[PDB]
From a paper:
The human [name] protein belongs to the eukaryotic protein superfamily DUF866 (PF05907), with unknown function. The two CXXC motifs were predicted to play a role of a zinc-binding motif, hence [name] and other DUF866 proteins are likely to be metalloproteins.
The final structure with two well-ordered full length [name] (residue 1–160) molecules was refined to Rwork of 0.1754 and Rfree 0.2203 with all backbone dihedral angles falling into the most favoured or allowed regions of the Ramachandran plot, as defined by Molprobity. Structure superimposition using SSM superpose in COOT shows that the two molecules of rC1ORF123 in the asymmetric unit are almost identical with RMSD of 0.45 Å for 160 Cα atoms. Protein interface analysis of the crystal structure of rC1ORF123 using PDBePISA shows that the two molecules of rC1ORF123 in the asymmetric unit of crystal only have a weak contact with an interface area of 598 Å2 (∼7% of a total surface area of rC1ORF123) suggesting that rC1ORF123 is likely not a biological dimer in solution as shown in the SEC analysis that was reported previously. Hence, a zinc ion interacting with the four-cysteine residues was modeled in each monomer of rC1ORF123 structure in the position bridging the loop β3–β4 and the loop β7–β8. To our surprise, structure examination of [name] shows that the N-terminal half (residues 1–91) and C-terminal half (residues 92–160) of [name] share a very similar fold to each other. In the rC1ORF123 structure, a molecule of glycerol and two water molecules were found in the closed-form cavity of the molecule B while five water molecules were modeled in the open-form cavity of the molecule A. The open-close conformation of the cavity is mediated by two ‘gate mediating’ residues D41 and K68. The glycerol molecule in the closed-form cavity interacts via hydrogen bonds with the main chain O atom of residues M31 and E38, main chain N atom of K68, and a water molecule that hydrogen bonded with the side-chain O atom of N74.
Residue numbers in the entry: 1 to 160
Write the structure that this text describes.
Amino acid sequence: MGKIALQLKATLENITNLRPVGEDFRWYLKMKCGNCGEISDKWQYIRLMDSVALKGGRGSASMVQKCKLCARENSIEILSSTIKPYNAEDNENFKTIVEFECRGLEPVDFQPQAGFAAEGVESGTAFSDINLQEKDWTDYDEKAQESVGIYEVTHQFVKC
Ligand SMILES: [Cl-]
Ligand SMILES: [Zn+2]
């Protein structure tokens, strides 16, 4: 078992409280088998709503997968109490937004897609259904009379 933090960085414009929303939120990841090193060929996602009870007091997992190359049964779990928003004050800094407990599947890449939400920095205008798949996003806050944006989204992994 190991924990891994996923840190986001983005440039924010007139936006705050940027966060994944809901138990159905999808963390799209490329995952590495911890025994044979095989990295998934396609993006896979994991979500809190898929939680499954592991046998024999081992706890739970968000995803269990038998490695196709070495037959190990590996798992990974999103830690829900570690999910944090990315705020106006975090602008352009890496910041941990979620942690995963890894039992033989470890993420080595991350693709933010849909399901994020955020709000106008002063207006509190709600923006939902934000898709970051392009790594840029723009909209207009009518209450603020300002453009809002999230640009140059990137990430990195910290082993905890
Ligand atoms: Cl998947
Ligand atoms: Zn393997």
